[PDB]
Amino acid sequence: MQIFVKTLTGKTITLVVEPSDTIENVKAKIQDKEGIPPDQQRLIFAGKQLEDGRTLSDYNIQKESTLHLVLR
């Protein structure tokens, strides 16, 4: 399973994930890719604000979904 995270400049990060990954796990992967601290990261999927402790499955994030990094 992979997801796409678009940064604030529109750069695409491609991540390998699992349905049970938390948003906090995803923020750690974005930090390794781009050097963005997790506390600087805010993510949305389909208009929903994603919380660190909830999982991809909890938000119905699927293969090939796109998330966005948005302003903190």
Residues contributing to the site for Zn ion (CB under 5 A): 18, 21, 25
**Residue 25 CB-density burial (10 A; 0-12 exposed, 13-18 middle, 19+ buried):** middle
Q: How far is the CB of 47 from Zn ion (least distance, A)?
A: 24
Residue number with CB closer to Zn ion (21 or 69): 21
**SS3 state of residue 42:** coil
Residue number with CB closer to Zn ion (8 or 34): 34
Residue number with CB closer to Zn ion (17 or 36): 17
CA distance 27 to 65: 16
